[PDB]
Design a protein around this nucleic acid. Structure first.
Lengths: 82, 80, 383, 162, 106, 73, 83, 95
RNA sequence: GGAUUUUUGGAGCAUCGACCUGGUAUUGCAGUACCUCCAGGAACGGUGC
């Protein structure tokens, strides 16, 4: 089917293999589960490493991101196409 | 026979896909491909030592999935 | 505000509309079990709303007993009514009709043809309270409870039929020890099952049934509910017999029976209450358990295909003919025409004759190609 | 015209010049800010330029928000429950406001993660010892009205109002 | 039509507190140069207003919530279900009587 | 099954970065379609300051992550 | 055939891109030539070595097996392949 | 086609997965080790060339450290497992 | 659709980014890894071992 093309051009968040999350407009895909994310932002959780320290998430914007399918784990929808 | 054809003939079934990196997504599987790509709707995803979040739709890859959990009311003789 | 007069009458009208909606729901026939369960849930929600409205109206009587002396006075009156008529003399420039005084609660307590749900119950769904294996109260899901029992027993020599036969007992000897951790499962298997009592009958009073179950547990089950002909009196908590009723009454206030054991009435009271509630739910829903056992036997006896069948249930014609071409007719209120031949056909028509009859020009052949009114008036004055 | 979810859904959301997700709501004249929870925590900057909001309150719980732009408004009073709704707020732009009293910046010290503040073009800066009172109220702010804090200003803030 | 409905509700609230049929708080208002066309039975809305005072007299019953508290309607869902079943049976009997009258007319 | 574009890196001194923090340098003498390289005069540098000469090394493509050319190429 | 992110990466050659290695290294440089299997050859690359230490390497070549992500420039955001 | 299916049947009856074919022969439970150190004991209903298995009445046990680690186990009725995570498959378990 | 680049699995130290003081040169028109230099205090954080 074409279930992967139905969520095209929308604000989707894909979970990486290392634990990061890339939220962006998934414009293009391929058979190898590649992703083209326009205005992408990667968020990685940092360890607290203490008893009273909280868990934070560092977020950095990259823009157009070409993500390979070997690092992508799962992708979820987050926002409509602007 | 390949096991991908048995998983491709599954729609609107509340399954639980346990991923490789400590993730478990329980939801209704709406689409499966030959490359074991599971597109599900109304999923509850629990990561490794994290709170179970809820998503309206999810698309997990085939190589990232580790195991699956099917309901008890699912005949395996007709799907093979 | 007229809390004694207007608010009480509004609450009575709302209660009467809720009773009429309930009578219209009960008078209508049912065809499916899911639609009947949805109608029962909507009726339970309407009954809860009517009970809340009655509770709100029943508390509006403190100031009424003080104001009844002023309200019943017939010597006083119309001066305050004249002040109220002067206060109701506001600007009448709000030209808007409001027929929704009684029509809006009548329409809120009704359903549509496309979806049989009320307006407060428009967001209710039967799929958010029951599973697909249950069938909206037709059967009970026991696969997870059987898996939990197989995990707690740590043995694979117990199938689904053996689990159903173990769960079918009400007052026999248990399969495991009463002081083990399986009772911690036996509460949880009760925790859905009593919820099934909330699921299979939403129109019944759950609070009155819970109070009756608590009264039967306190007045009878704690006082020797199983007499014999050690067999004379049995205790559910202490799991020991008794010679006579006087000995059981003397040992009921004893030190190992109060807090001096691991199964006494202090710590193991909640487990005994959960076991009594599970026994009451199994006695109340034995037909549903028998139907679930018959469905499990039919699913086990069927083949693969039978189990799968059980689980599956034109621009060229508009360009050649001169269409889509704007033409203006100033005689018929500057109307539009999408064709020259269409305009020539509509000139000798009833609409053009009615448009020309207002100016006083007779319908003749000289005014066939006349478009402007100032030219048609000159053509009529020239003849 | 009141603010609702339709005006937030029809607004343009893109990437700003600071490489963050920003939704523009300029030229709306909203008298009250409400129903802002429809963004699903997918924005870091919210612009509210050319608005008639008399009080900055009614903000839902948004953890992804890090910059607030309330410039060119008529904000006379300030809300108190702003720190419980934006725990990760870093930039606050309250330029061209109607703040007159020094106490109106008293809930503004409730934000612990706040570092940038802008209170220019306001009558509250017209009074004496305004920057010293703002430094003594919220010590976590590092940039106040496009000016970095100093050690002598912190000493004058700790010495005053003792 | 909100002002006329409010005036009809005020007239139904003021006429229901009378101690007699003709000695009311609206009969003297008719002689006190207050124009009230809804008092006469020639208007159709008075047929609603005679119902409205019938609601106001329904706010005057001793089980209406003035000196007593309803327990069956407010704390018994089974009694409400039995009343709804009795109303459905009365509606079915009325429909059967209407069908019998239509058969007799035919 | 297309071969990589390693023609500019042929007969030139480069330094590859293997998996697990390994580092080696040498002259690339050939290329494979599976990204397997052959390095002559190969010296591997571990975490210590010492570097061990290997002479002739053959590295698979599954372990090489990057390769910086130390020459003009 | 050829993939659409593969065609986007092939069209991104000649501009300043930024690839990410599997070990956490981010190399930003001018992509001279690309391949169908995500093999990225970049000049004037700046390595971070997953610790922030940005060094300047010349004529680097990262294979597609370790490439986790590739930050494309925004000037290719109006490409007709993405539509 | 038919010859490829006969070759696959011969490779499943005489090759390395023939013990897995034993799970289709007498319906006996097999012990499969996973990549996350989770041993699953249960029979295999269906298999393939890529070692993807369909298990029925499986018991998955593992070691979780809270001290000393406990043997926390679970019981799944029907499950599917990819062949990429299968480490070692034993036909006849001890217990 | 199973053999190295995507899909039937390798599973206290080093470095960088910040925070605050002093003196110092550049007053300059552009689509950016980072940008003057030196001295001082830190009880700040990210990654691997």
């Amino acid at each position: 089917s074409s279930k992967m093309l139905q969520h095209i051009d929308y604000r989707m968040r894909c979970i990486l293999q290392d634990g990061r999350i890339f939220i962006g407009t998934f414009k293009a895909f391929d058979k190898h589960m590649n992703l083209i994310l326009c205005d992408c932002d990667e968020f990685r959780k940092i360890k607290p490493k203490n008893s009273k320290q909280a868990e934070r998430e560092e977020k950095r914007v990259l823009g157009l991101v070409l993500l390979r399918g070997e690092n992508l784990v799962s992708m979820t929808v987050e926002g409509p196409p602007p | 026979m390949k096991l991908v054809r048995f998983l491709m003939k599954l729609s609107h079934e509340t399954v639980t896909i346990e991923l490789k990196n400590g993730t478990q997504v329980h939801g209704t599987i709406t689409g499966v491909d030959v490359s074991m790509n599971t597109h599900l709707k109304a999923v509850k995803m629990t990561l490794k030592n994290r709170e179970p979040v809820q998503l309206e739709t999810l698309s997990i890859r085939g190589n990232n999935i580790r195991y699956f959990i099917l309901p008890d009311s699912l005949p395996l003789d007709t799907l093979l | 505000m007229e809390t004694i007069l207007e608010q009480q009458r509004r609450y009575h009208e709302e209660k009467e509309r809720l009773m009429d909606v309930m009578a219209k729901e009960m008078l209508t026939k049912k065809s499916t079990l899911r639609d009947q369960i949805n109608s029962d849930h909507r009726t339970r929600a309407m009954q809860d709303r009517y009970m809340e409205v009655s509770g709100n109206l029943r508390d509006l009587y403190d100031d009424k007993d003080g104001l009844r002396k002023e309200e019943l006075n017939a010597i006083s009156g119309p001066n305050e009514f004249a002040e109220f008529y002067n206060r109701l003399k506001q600007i009448k420039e709000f030209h808007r009709k409001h027929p929704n005084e009684i029509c809006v609660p009548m329409s809120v307590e009704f359903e549509e043809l496309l979806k049989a749900r009320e307006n407060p119950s428009e967001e209710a769904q039967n799929l958010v309270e029951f599973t697909d294996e249950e069938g909206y109260g037709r059967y009970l899901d026991l696969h997870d409870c059987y898996l939990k029992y197989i995990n707690l027993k740590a043995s694979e020599k117990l199938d689904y039929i053996t689990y159903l036969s173990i769960f079918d007992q009400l007052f026999d000897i248990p399969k495991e020890r009463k002081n083990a951790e399986y009772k911690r499962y036996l509460e949880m298997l009760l925790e859905y099952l009593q919820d099934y009592t909330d699921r299979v009958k939403p129109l019944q009073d759950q609070n009155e049934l819970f109070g009756k179950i608590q009264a039967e547990f306190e007045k009878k089950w704690e006082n020797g509910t199983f007499p014999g002909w050690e067999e004379r009196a049995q205790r559910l908590f202490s799991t020991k017999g008794k010679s006579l009723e006087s000995l059981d009454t003397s040992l009921f206030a004893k030190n190992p029976k109060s807090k001096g054991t691991k199964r006494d009435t202090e710590r193991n009271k909640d487990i005994a209450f959960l076991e009594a509630q599970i026994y009451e739910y199994v006695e109340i829903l034995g037909e549903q358990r028998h139907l679930t056992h018959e469905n499990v036997q039919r699913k086990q006896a069927r083949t693969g295909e039978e189990r799968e069948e059980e689980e599956e249930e034109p621009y060229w014609l508009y360009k050649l003919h001169g269409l889509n071409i704007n033409y203006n007719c100033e005689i018929c209120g500057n109307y539009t025409y999408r064709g020259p031949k269409a305009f020539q056909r509509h000139f000798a028509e009833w609409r053009h004759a009615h448009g020309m009859r207002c100016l006083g020009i007779p319908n003749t052949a000289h005014f066939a190609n006349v478009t402007q009114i100032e030219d048609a008036v000159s053509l009529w004055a020239k003849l | 015209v009141k603010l609702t979810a339709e005006l937030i859904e029809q607004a343009a959301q893109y990437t700003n010049a600071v490489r963050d997700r920003e939704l523009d709501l300029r030229g709306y004249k909203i008298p009250v800010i409400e129903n802002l929870g429809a963004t699903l925590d997918q924005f870091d900057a919210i612009d509210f330029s050319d608005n008639e909001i008399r009080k900055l309150d009614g903000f839902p719980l948004l953890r992804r928000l890090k910059t607030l732009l309330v410039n060119n408004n008529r904000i006379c009073r300030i809300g108190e429950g702003l720190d419980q709704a934006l725990p990760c707020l870093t930039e606050l732009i309250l330029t061209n406001n109607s703040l007159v009293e020094l106490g109106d910046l008293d809930p503004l010290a409730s934000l612990k993660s706040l570092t940038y503040l802008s209170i220019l073009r306001n009558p509250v800066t017209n009074k004496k010892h305004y920057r010293l009172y703002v430094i003594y109220k919220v010590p976590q702010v590092r940039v106040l009205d496009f000016q970095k804090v100093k050690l002598k200003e912190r000493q004058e803030a700790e010495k005053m109002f003792k | 039509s909100a002002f006329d409905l409010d005036v009809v509700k005020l007239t139904a609230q003021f006429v229901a507190r009378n101690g007699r049929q003709f000695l009311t708080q609206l009969m003297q208002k008719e002689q006190r140069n207050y124009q009230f066309d809804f008092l006469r039975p020639q208007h159709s809305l008075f047929n609603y207003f005679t119902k409205l005072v019938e609601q106001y007299t329904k706010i005057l019953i001793p089980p209406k919530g003035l000196f007593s508290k309803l327990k069956k309607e407010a704390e018994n869902p089974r009694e409400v279900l039995d009343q709804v079943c009795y109303r459905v049976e009365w509606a079915k009997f009325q429909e059967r009587e209407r069908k019998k009258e239509e058969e007799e007319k035919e | 099954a297309h071969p990589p574009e390693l023609k500019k890196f042929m007969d030139k001194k480069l330094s590859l970065k293997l998996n697990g923090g390994r580092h080696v340098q040498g002259i690339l003498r050939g290329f494979d379609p599976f990204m397997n390289l052959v390095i002559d005069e190969c010296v591997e540098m571990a975490t210590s300051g010492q570097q061990n000469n290997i002479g002739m090394v053959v590295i698979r493509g599954n372990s090489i992550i990057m390769l910086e050319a130390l020459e003009r190429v | 055939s050829i993939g659409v992110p593969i065609k986007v990466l092939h069209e991104a050659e000649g501009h300043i891109v930024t690839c990410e290695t599997n070990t956490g290294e981010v190399y930003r440089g001018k992509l001279i030539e690309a391949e169908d299997n995500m093999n990225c050859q970049m000049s004037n690359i700046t390595v971070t070595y997953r610790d922030g230490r940005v060094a300047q390497l010349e004529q680097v070549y990262i294979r597609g097996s370790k490439i986790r992500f590739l930050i494309l420039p925004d000037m290719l955001k109006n490409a007709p392949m993405l539509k | 086609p038919e010859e490829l299916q006969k070759r696959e049947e011969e490779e499943f009856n005489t090759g390395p997965l023939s013990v897995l074919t034993q799970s289709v022969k007498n319906n006996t439970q097999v012990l499969i080790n996973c990549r996350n150190n989770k041993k699953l004991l249960g029979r295999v209903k269906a298999f393939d060339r890529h070692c993807n298995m369909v298990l029925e009445n499986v018991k998955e046990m593992w070691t979780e450290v809270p001290s000393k680690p406990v043997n926390k186990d679970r019981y799944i009725s029907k499950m599917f497992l990819r062949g990429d995570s299968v480490i070692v498959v034993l036909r006849n378990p001890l217990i």
